Design a protein around this ligand. Sequence first.
Ligand SMILES: C[C@@H](N[C@@H](CCCN)C(=O)O)C(=O)O
Length: 254
Amino acid sequence: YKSITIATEGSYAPYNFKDAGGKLIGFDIDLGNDLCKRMNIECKFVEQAWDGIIPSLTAGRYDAIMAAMGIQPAREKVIAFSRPYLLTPMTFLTTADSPLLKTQVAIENLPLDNITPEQKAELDKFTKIFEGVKFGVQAGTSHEAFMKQMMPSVQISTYDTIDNVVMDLKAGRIDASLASVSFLKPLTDKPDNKDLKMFGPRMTGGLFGKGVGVGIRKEDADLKALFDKAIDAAIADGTVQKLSQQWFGYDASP
Ligand SMILES: C[C@@H](N[C@@H](CCCN)C(=O)O)C(=O)O
């Protein structure tokens, strides 16, 4: 390799989004440039809408995906991933005045790889509470996958982008959503969003898989080995922790 094209969404702050000048910025952009510098490869970032991100990678329109992509088992059937460059649980989002906030959380940290009757009871409690509520999710995400598989009886509306989900939640058109803590903590930390609150269990594993990784074509074993080595070095020297603090306001590094 001499040069690679990396796709990003361009609308998932603070991982990847556009600055005032329309330039792609975020944790994925800074890390992507840092990993490529280590790999001694020229780096170029392209904007790609969420729906075609995986098929455009397999079709060879670009070489890699760095777009807050969860290493989910369903995505692993189609593409390969680098080792994780970030770890984050998943949680729910509502308004600060919502009665959903008074719901008792019996399991703070909910692993989903194996589901015990106690963990199922907790998911069933939340499903029954969410049955009388309007949920909104971004289409084609692990957020939609979770609602479809784990809470099918809950009424969901799907959106093109996460920004539209947040806007409708703020406008009162939906009552709740879900995303990773890495997305929701900087969102709710903004003085702009004091009327928004994270709530419910912090979930890991199962359909979510473990961590956020670089999406690569399965046949590109050499490119994966290069990214894995670069990621190991960026973690070891404190670069991932530094970039995580900068963009997320906390340490989500593996
Ligand atoms: C970490 C990030 N993962 C989402 C990203 C959605 C970006 N459009 C996913 O893997 O589907 C999140 O849930 O916050």
